[PDB]
Each structure stands twice: as C-alpha cells, then as structure tokens.
Amino acid sequence: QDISIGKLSRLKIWITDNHLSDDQWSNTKKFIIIKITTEDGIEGWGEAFSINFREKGIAIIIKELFREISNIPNLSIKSFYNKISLLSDGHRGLDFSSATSAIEIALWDISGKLKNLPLNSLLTKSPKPNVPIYATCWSDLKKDTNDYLRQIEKFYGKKYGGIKIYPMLDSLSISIQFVEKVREIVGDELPLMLDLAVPEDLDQTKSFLKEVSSFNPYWIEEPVDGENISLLTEIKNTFNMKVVTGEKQSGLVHFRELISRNAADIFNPDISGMGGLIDIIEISNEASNNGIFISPHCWNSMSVSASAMLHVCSSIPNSEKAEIFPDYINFSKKFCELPFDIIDNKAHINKSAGLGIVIHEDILSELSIYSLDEK
Amino acid sequence: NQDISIGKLSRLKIWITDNHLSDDQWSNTKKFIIIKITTEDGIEGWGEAFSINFREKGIAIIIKELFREISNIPNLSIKSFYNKISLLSDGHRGLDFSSATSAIEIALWDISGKLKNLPLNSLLTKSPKPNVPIYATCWSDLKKDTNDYLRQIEKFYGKKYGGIKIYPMLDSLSISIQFVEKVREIVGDELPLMLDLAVPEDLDQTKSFLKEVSSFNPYWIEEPVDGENISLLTEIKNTFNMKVVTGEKQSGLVHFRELISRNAADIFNPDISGMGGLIDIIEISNEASNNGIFISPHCWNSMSVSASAMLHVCSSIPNSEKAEIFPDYINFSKKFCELPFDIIDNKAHINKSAGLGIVIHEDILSELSIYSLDEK
Ligand SMILES: [Mg+2]
Ligand SMILES: [Mg+2]
Ligand SMILES: [Mg+2]
Numbered sequence: 001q002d003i004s005i006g007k008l009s010r011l012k013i014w015i016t017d018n019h020l021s022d023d024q025w026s027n028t029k030k031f032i033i034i035k036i037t038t039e040d041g042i043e044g045w046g047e048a049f050s051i052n053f054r055e056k057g058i059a060i061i062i063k064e065l066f067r068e069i070s071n072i073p074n075l076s077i078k079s080f081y082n083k084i085s086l087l088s089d090g091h092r093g094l095d096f097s098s099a100t101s102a103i104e105i106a107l108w109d110i111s112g113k114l115k116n117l118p119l120n121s122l123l124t125k126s127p128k129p130n131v132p133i134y135a136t137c138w139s140d141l142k143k144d145t146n147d148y149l150r151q152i153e154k155f156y157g158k159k160y161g162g163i164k165i166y167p168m169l170d171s172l173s174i175s176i177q178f179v180e181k182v183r184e185i186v187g188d189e190l191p192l193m194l195d196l197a198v199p200e201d202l203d204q205t206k207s208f209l210k211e212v213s214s215f216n217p218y219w220i221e222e223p224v225d226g227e228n229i230s231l232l233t234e235i236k237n238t239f240n241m242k243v244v245t246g247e248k249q250s251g252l253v254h255f256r257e258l259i260s261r262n263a264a265d266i267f268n269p270d271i272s273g274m275g276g277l278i279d280i281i282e283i284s285n286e287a288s289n290n291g292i293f294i295s296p297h298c299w300n301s302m303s304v305s306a307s308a309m310l311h312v313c314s315s316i317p318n319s320e321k322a323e324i325f326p327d328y329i330n331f332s333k334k335f336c337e338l339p340f341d342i343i344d345n346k347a348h349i350n351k352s353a354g355l356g357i358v359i360h361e362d363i364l365s366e367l368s369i370y371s372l373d374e375k
Numbered sequence: 376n377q378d379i380s381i382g383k384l385s386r387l388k389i390w391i392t393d394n395h396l397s398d399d400q401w402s403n404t405k406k407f408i409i410i411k412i413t414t415e416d417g418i419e420g421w422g423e424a425f426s427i428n429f430r431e432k433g434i435a436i437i438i439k440e441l442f443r444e445i446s447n448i449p450n451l452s453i454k455s456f457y458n459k460i461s462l463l464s465d466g467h468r469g470l471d472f473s474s475a476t477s478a479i480e481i482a483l484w485d486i487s488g489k490l491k492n493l494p495l496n497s498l499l500t501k502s503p504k505p506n507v508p509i510y511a512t513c514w515s516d517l518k519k520d521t522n523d524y525l526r527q528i529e530k531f532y533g534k535k536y537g538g539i540k541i542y543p544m545l546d547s548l549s550i551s552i553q554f555v556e557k558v559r560e561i562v563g564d565e566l567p568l569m570l571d572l573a574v575p576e577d578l579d580q581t582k583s584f585l586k587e588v589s590s591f592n593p594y595w596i597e598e599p600v601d602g603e604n605i606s607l608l609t610e611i612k613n614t615f616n617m618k619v620v621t622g623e624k625q626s627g628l629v630h631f632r633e634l635i636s637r638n639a640a641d642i643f644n645p646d647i648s649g650m651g652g653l654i655d656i657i658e659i660s661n662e663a664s665n666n667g668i669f670i671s672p673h674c675w676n677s678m679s680v681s682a683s684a685m686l687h688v689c690s691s692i693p694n695s696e697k698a699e700i701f702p703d704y705i706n707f708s709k710k711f712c713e714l715p716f717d718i719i720d721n722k723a724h725i726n727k728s729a730g731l732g733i734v735i736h737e738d739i740l741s742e743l744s745i746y747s748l749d750e751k
Pocket of ligand 3: 573598
C-alpha cells in the first residue's frame with residue numbers, strides 16, 4: 001500500500017449496456033469498468049458499483065479524481081487514500097465511494113503487477129487458495145413463483161455453497177410458502193440466505209421473521225434500513241438469526257457504529273462500493289475483533305469486481321461466503337477470460353499478478369453504451 | 376399542495392459557477408450548481424444543489440439523467456416526483472444524489488408556487504412568519520491569522536445579525552480558547568456565539584476544549600464528532616450542558632429518525648439543498664418538533680436560490696432555529712440575482728412573490744460559470 005506507483009498517464013472507462021441473458025432470466029445492469037495506465041506503462045483494472053441513473057455521474061467523478069491525482073509523481077495506494085480523505089472533507093455517499101473504489105482497485109492491481117504478486121498475496125502472507133461462494137437468485141424482470149423455483153433447482157444442481165433468495169412477496173402466507181418450497185428443493189442442509197431488501201412495513205417484517213425461523217435461514221439480510229441502527233439491534237436481539245447489513249452504505253464511521261451498537265453479525269458492503277480495499281480490509285479486521293464476518297456484496301460484473309472480492313475473501317480470517325450472480329457469468333466471459341473458476345461450492349482464484357484480469361477491450365467497447373479514454 | 380399538477384417538463388438548464396472572490400476578497404466562493412426547469416406550459420422553476428468539491432459535474436449529470444427520466448411523466452407533481460425518486464433509488468442514497476434530487480424538487484416547488492400564484496411559504500403552511508431570524512457564519516478558505524478573523528468578526532458585529540458562528544479549533548487548546556475569548560470581547564455577552572468544531576480528529580482535544588469553553592456561553596456546539604458516530608454524539612451531549620448540532624453532512628429521513636430515537640442532538644442542520652428535498656426537510660422538522668429538537672438549516676450554497684428555499688422553509692415551521700447566512704456571499708449573489716429577501720439586522724425578510732421569488736440575469740450567471748448544460 002506504500003508501493004510507489006509513479007505518475008498516472010491514461011484513463012479508460014466503459015459503461016456496458018444492459019444485456020439479456022441467453023436463457024432470458026435477467027438483464028445485466030450497466031457495469032462501470034475502468035483501466036488506468038501509469039507513466040511506466042503498467043495497467044490496472046477497477047470497477048465501480050453502478051447505480052441506476054447515476055452511472056455517467058459516477059464515471060464523471062472518476063474522471064475528475066483521475067485528473068487531480070494523475071500528476072502526483074509518487075502516487076501510492078496510501079497517498080491516493082489520504083488525498084481522497086482530504087478532498088472529501090467528510091462528505092460521503094455511495095456514488096462517490098463507488099468512484100473512489102474503482103480507482104483504488106486499479107491501484108491495487110497495478111501494485112500487484114509491480115511486486116509480481118496476486119492481490120491476495122499482497123494482503124496476507126498465506127492466502128486461502130479456494131473461496132467459498134454462494135449464488136444469488138434474482139431478476140430485474142417480473143417472475144412468478146415457479147419461474148424462481150425452476151432457477152433455484154438449476155442452482156441447486158451446481159452445488160454452490162449456498163443460495164440467496166428474496167422471499168418478501170405479496171403476503172405473509174405466500175412469502176413463507178415460497179421459503180417452504182425452496183426448502184423442498186435444497187433440503188435442510190444447504191445454506192439458504194434470505195434477502196428481505198428493506199420491507200417498508202416493520203410489522204410485516206416482524207411477522208415474517210416469527211414465521212420463518214422454522215426453516216433455519218442461514219442469514220437475514222437487510223430486514224430494516226441500514227441506517228436504522230436501533231431497529232437492527234432490536235431485530236438482531238429479538239430473533240436468533242444472523243443479521244446482514246451494509247451493501248447500501250459506505251465509510252468506516254457507519255460500520256464502526258454498527259459494531260458499537262451490536263447491530264449486525266455479518267457486514268456486506270459492496271466490494272466496489274465501500275470506498276476501496278483499504279477500508280474493506282480495515283473494517284474486516286475490526287469486525288473480526290468483534291465476532292462479525294464479512295460477506296462482500298457483488299452486484300457487479302463477474303470480472304474485475306468478482307476478482308477483487310475473491311482476493312479479499314481469501315485474505316481475511318472472518319470471510320463469509322462470497323456472492324456470485326450466475327446469470328452474469330456468461331456475459332462477463334464475453335470480454336474477460338475470468339481469473340477464477342467455480343468448482344461446486346468454491347472459487348479457485350489466480351496466482352498471477354494483481355487481479356489476473358485479461359480483457360478483450362475491442363469486445364468490451366462493442367458492449368458499451370458510454371466510454372472515456374483520456375491521457 | 377404536493378399534488379399540484381405540473382405536467383410534462385420541456386427544458387433543463389444547469390450552471391456550475393466558477394470560484395470567484397467573495398465580498399471584500401474575504402474568501403473564494405465555492406462552485407454553485409443552480410438549475411432552471413421549464414415545464415411544457417412554460418412555467419419556470421429554479422433549484423440549487425448542495426455542491427461538493429470534485430463532484431459538481433457528477434451532480435449535474437445526475438440531475439440531467441433524472442430530468443430525462445421524469446420529463447415525459449404527463450401528470451408530474453412534487454409528490455409523484457418524490458415517489459419516483461424513492462422507487463428508482465431503491466435505498467441507495469448519499470450526499471451527491473440527495474443534492475441532485477434537492478435541486479429538482481426545489482424547482483418543482485417554485486413551479487408549484489407559480490401555478491398557485493403564491494409564495495412557497497404559503498404553500499407550506501397557512502400563516503407563515505414573514506421574517507426569519509438569521510446568524511452569520513465567519514469562515515474562509517484563504518490563509519489568514521486570528522487577527523484577520525477578528526476584524527471580520529467586528530464587521531459582522533456592526534451588522535447586528537442574530538448571531539455569529541466561528542470555527543475555533545486552532546493550533547492548540549489555549550490558542551483556540553484565546554480566540555473564543557477575544558471574539559466574546561468584540562461581540563459582548565448577549566450575542567449568540569455559535570461554535571463549529573468541524574469534526575475534530577482527536578476526541579480528547581474536543582473534550583478539553585469543551586471543558587474550557589463553557590464559560591464563554593456558546594449558543595451551540597456544531598459537529599463536535601462525526602454525525603454518523605451516534606454513540607459519540609450521545610456521549611458528548613450527555614457530558615456537556617451545551618446545545619449539540621449535527622446533520623449538515625448527512626441526508627435521508629432514516630439517519631435523522633435514528634438521531635431522534637437516540638436523543639443524540641438538540642438541533643439538526645441538514646443543508647437546505649442537500650437533504651434530498653423540501654418534503655424531507657419538512658417531515659424531519661415535524662418529527663424533531665414533537666421531540667423537542669429544533670432545525671437550523673445549513674446553507675453553504677449561493678445566497679440566491681438555496682437561501683430563498685431555506686427562508687421559506689424556516690418561516691413555515693414552528694421549531695426553526697436561526698437560519699445560516701454567509702454575508703460574504705451576499706453581494707456576489709447580487710451580481711446575478713435580485714435577491715428575494717432583505718437582511719435587516721437580525722432577520723431576513725422574505726418577499727411576497729410567487730414560489731421562491733427568483734429573478735436571475737442568466738447572461739451574468741453564464742459569464743460567472745465554468746460549466747453549463749442545456750437539455751430538452
Ligand atoms: Mg441484499
Ligand atoms: Mg458486540
Ligand atoms: Mg458546520
């Protein structure tokens with residue numbers, strides 16, 4: 001992190017268009033992927049957590065930050081981090097944190113290349129070679145319950161380390177019947193994660209959690225808004241179930257308040273959304289000292305973001321299962337020779353330098369709706 | 376009144392002002408982000424986003440994208456706008472986005488005021504206060520000694536504002552205290568003197584300062600700790616017998632509801648152009664009121680569109696505290712805006728024009744701008 005990178009010379013940004021999967025399950029979100037090249041010709045890849053209607057705004061922020069840091073002759077990951085601290089002056093938000101994550105991730109990739117080390121080897125002496133994963137089952141398109149059940153059975157056959165579903169439906173009985181039907185497929189052994197996605201009615205959430213405990217969910221994600229610290233503590237303390245929060249927030253101070261208030265058991269900040277890897281690792285360590293696990297959120301491409309997450313999870317003692325969107329794999333494969341492979345419940349990651357990213361830029365450009373290249 | 380039908384939107388203009396020297400060369404003005412939306416029926420509304428260094432163009436691009444999405448909604452209103460924002464954001468917030476939606480919502484309020492031929496405060500409550508108590512913030516980004524601040528504080532004193540806010544955390548505890556002491560000597564014992572600690576890195580310095588400063592009777596203590604560290608805010612509020620202010624760097628209803636739940640502050644100061652919009656500022660003002668908490672909107676923005684929205688909001692709530700002005704931004708803002716209020720001693724007097732009462736000379740605003748966007 002104190003590795004001298006030198007001066008930055010070039011920035012390219014792609015924003016991919018939405019793409020319908022071959023099986024028609026879902027459309028990909030627009031991804032924001034960046035490549036930074038140093039004066040010495042070293043390339044690093046980054047990815048920003050993309051947010052609907054804000055992708056171009058995030059990309060513009062990245063370009064403005066790049067301009068500001070690009071003539072710093074002794075840039076390092078740490079000095080970038082410190083410059084951002086100064087510039088930001090305590091004004092925080094997800095869009096800004098996504099922009100800084102993309103740049104910082106690229107600097108980590110470059111630093112790996114400079115040391116001839118995979119990112120996980122930069123982070124710890126003895127990283128884990130295989131990373132437990134789980135699969136998220138979600139679509140942007142309207143589905144009926146049987147549509148989901150069919151997709152879930154497909155996931156079950158792949159032998160992922162777990163499956164995450166979104167069970168908050170039109171009514172309590174329908175929601176719990178969905179959970180029961182999923183259990184009919186996966187059995188009682190498989191980690192089954194439940195993403196409640198911040199239900200608007202707290203009483204509906206309380207009834208659901210009262211009714212679902214018999215199905216032994218592996219975790220309960222976002223039962224209330226992440227800034228509702230008091231209700232997270234209450235929920236966590238009322239039900240015996242592991243509470244996950246963090247995907248929609250960023251910055252150390254928020255997560256330190258979650259720790260102080262015993263508000264969650266697992267944090268899931270987005271790998272490309274927290275602000276960068278320095279803060280992901282720092283909160284991972286603090287969490288580990290307080291019995292909290294880290295399961296980075298990764299609603300991003302299965303290329304750059306996914307590699308960053310796998311490296312981080314392989315480097316920390318308190319990782320939980322890492323998030324995969326199987327329906328995003330084939331699209332990511334179009335332009336990226338992926339630096340990992342999935343065998344049953346684990347991803348085996350690159351031992352090559354940095355993030356191990358090999359992207360066919362011509363294809364990435366073909367798939368993009370917006371771009372930037374800037375010396 | 377949030378149901379007032381606005382219709383389809385036809386045009387967006389955005390200006391981002393360059394930095395300029397403020398009045399009497401006291402500071403550089405920050406870059407401002409001011410927007411004008413024109414509806415299909417030809418009604419013009421003005422908004423302003425809370426601008427953030429290196430993010431100004433990013434914020435403008437977000438406003439532009441939001442505008443495109445909402446411009447074809449035939450039966451658009453403040454309410455349907457608010458609901459649409461809630462749907463598309465899906466709990467992803469942050470200051471930049473909240474600044475973008477503030478600017479658009481504020482413009483829709485201006486439009487709504489114009490459609491009813493009523494000033495905004497009259498849309499907000501039946502019987503608004505015509506006058507709004509204010510206080511002046513003394514802050515500069517230019518290099519000065521304590522002496523330069525003192526002469527500026529004499530100037531402000533002369534102006535008979537409702538209060539003066541200073542930033543007293545200097546090189547050391549005793550230099551910080553000396554500064555507060557000298558200020559109190561200039562302004563006398565009666566004047567509200569507010570202290571903005573600006574989130575000191577070292578909690579021990581903060582505690583030592585607050586222990587020594589209490590004898591100077593500060594009116595309030597602003598941001599003694601990070602606004603997201605609710606645990607520490609409560610600890611500070613519980614330790615000292617001084618009013619605690621927080622909120623300027625946060626947005627969204629949920630965080631402020633948590634602060635209320637936790638009795639974590641005495642006054643909230645979300646920025647008028649940063650909270651997300653007026654609906655949310657008013658909603659939190661009402662909840663705060665029920666809990667004995669006052670609202671003093673933060674306004675580090677132009678003294679044109681943002682200041683007018685702030686004054687209209689403050690005039691319409693029963694639990695307003697003194698409203699923030701940057702005196703050095705007043706004549707700068709006067710370059711392009713015939714301001715819709717007059718500061719008379721300790722109170723800003725709102726005019727009776729429809730909506731926010733904005734009269735802006737766009738060619739002057741353009742001349743002062745580093746960036747601009749014009750969208751159909
Ligand atoms: Mg989730
Ligand atoms: Mg604990
Ligand atoms: Mg302040």
